[PDB]
Structures are given as C-alpha cells and as structure tokens.
Design a protein around this nucleic acid. Sequence first.
DNA 1: GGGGGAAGGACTA
DNA 2: CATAGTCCTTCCCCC
Length: 342
Amino acid sequence: MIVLFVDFDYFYAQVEEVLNPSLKGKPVVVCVFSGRFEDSGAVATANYEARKFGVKAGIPIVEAKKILPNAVYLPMRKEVYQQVSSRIMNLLREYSEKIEIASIDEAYLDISDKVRDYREAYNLGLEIKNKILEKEKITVTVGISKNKVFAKIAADMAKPNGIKVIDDEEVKRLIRELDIADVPGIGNITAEKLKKLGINKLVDTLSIEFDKLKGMIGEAKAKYLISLARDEYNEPIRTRVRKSIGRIVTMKRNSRNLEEIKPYLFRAIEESYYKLDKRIPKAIHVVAVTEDLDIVSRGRTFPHGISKETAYSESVKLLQKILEEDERKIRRIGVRFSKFIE
DNA sequence: GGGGGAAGGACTA
DNA sequence: CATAGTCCTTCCCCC
Ligand SMILES: [Ca+2]
Ligand SMILES: [Ca+2]
Ligand SMILES: [Ca+2]
C-alpha cells in the first residue's frame, strides 16, 4: 500500500499570513483569548519566526508576550481557516477517491492505484504541493510510506514546506530508533508512563508482557504500538467512523433569552456541518449546559436526512422546548449529530 | 459482539 | 468549570 499524507504548515498562522502578506517574516501568533481577563488563554499556533524564540502551541499568551512582546498576536478565526481548509481538501480530492480527512489541517490519500512506486509517489507529492501553492498560496508538507502512521511521521520530520518518503527499510530502522513520544496519537502522559516501564522505542513494546503494557496505557494503545513495532500496521484510508459529531460553545453570559442564544447555537451548527462534510445525519440533539453545569438535551430523528438549514430551524424548536422545560439559565449551548446514512 | 451514550482522561488526531 | 476543543477510555444499557 502507498500512503500519501498532507499537513498544512503552521496552518492557522499561515492563513493569517496569506490574508495579510505584510505579516510574512515577522513572528505571528494565533491565540485563543479565553476571556477571563486581558490576554488570558493559550497560543493555538505560531509561525516559525515565533518558534525561534520558544513561542509555540499551548503556552500561555501572557508568557508568549514576555518572550516576544512585539510579535503580532491575533485571535483565533476558526471559521476562516475551515473555509480555506475545505477548499484545499477539495483540491486533494482530485488526486484520490480514497481519502481520509483527519483534521482541519491534514488528510491521508491512498494512492496505491495511482502510482506504481515511491519515485512516482514523490513526483505526485510535488504535483500536489505545487497545485495547492498555485491555488491558495499555502505551503504543505507531504509524507509518504506504507501505512498511515509512517506517512504522517515522515511529514512531521520533513516540515515545513517539505516532502519525504519513508521506504520499507527505513521503516524497519525507525521502529528501532524512533522516540516513542514521536508516534502519532501518543502524547506526553502516555510517553512518561512508558518511560517509567523503561520503554523508549516502538521495538521496546515487543519485550514486555502485553498485560503489563495494557495495564499502564489501555488496551487500544497497547495493541496499537504493538502492531506498529511488528510492522503489521495496516488500516484503510477510510472516512472516519464517528458515533456523533457535534460542537458546544460557551456563551459570554449565562442566559435564557432565545434571541441571545441563537447566534452561538448557529455557530455550533456551522462548525458541526463543516466537520460532518459528506456525512449525513438522521439525528440531531440540542445540548445545553446550565448555569449550575447540568446537561440538558432534546433531540429528534428524521427518517430522511438533516440538511444544514433544516438543522438551523429544527434546533431552535428543540432549544425552545428546553427553555420551557428547564427554568435555569444556560451557560453553554450546542448540538450533536448522529445516526448517519451510508 | 458491538453500537452508542455518560463522564473523566489524553492528545493536538 | 478555571487553555479550548477533539478525540480516547472505560463502563454499562441495549439491540
Ligand atoms: Ca500543520
Ligand atoms: Ca496537523
Ligand atoms: Ca502535531
């Protein structure tokens, strides 16, 4: 199998650079201003000019400002990035039918039937990079290998504006030399737990009692790392299997005023439909988190399929039913979609 | 056997 | 609640 992975480089910040070219070359830091007080919140993504000085994903905005007081700090514009992202995903759609959109900034293409080998996979990666740069002026990094995991690792290694193939032999080498912390889906907490079991490489998970490994990190992650270590990993590039897809936004002030709530609910729906993409729900649940943090929800099933605009109007009715049946103010409001058609 | 929902955990998917 | 959101983990009801 030949898998080609694409990640859009320092995406939120790059998009901002594209919408305002004067920012290029200067440190740029997109942040999620949490609203608790001036500069509360954490950095979402920073460009490389900012990473040079340690400003990066997840550190407090207040700290970023101490290290780089004169950088350009911008608020998160999730909607803008989703729109720019969907267009890029549409371009990727031209290169393969088997595509798996993983998040707003990345996707996997199974190109097993479009190319005969890595040399051709590589030329295709350059084509793709050139297409996106041409259409949207956004640089991306391509990772190519025998499965999803190694294709992503290659992009992580080659970024930004890069391309890299990890052939079968290097896969065998990496299974032995790759810090476990660098494996997709594996974060710090799990990394630390394994360090403590004296595990630092994929290969290491092959010399420990499965039940001892499972006991520390869960069955799913234990099988996972193991199937990789045995170069036995092979999961299809399939549209992800999801129970429900939703979004819950925290409002600025608790409320029970139908008109005041609406906007937030709609932003929730908007975002939700962007995340649903081709998937079509039959069920919609409106979800409210009350002032005292209780969860209240009212849903409805539609034998046909729920269009975005129908979700807009049917949710409002569900929201009204909630207000009539619970007199508490609402703090957070959102929606959930489930039971998809095939 | 596994869908799928509740509530807390871990990853940036 | 106390960086937010997304997705994962564990457990239990239920088909
Ligand atoms: Ca990225
Ligand atoms: Ca990414
Ligand atoms: Ca990452």
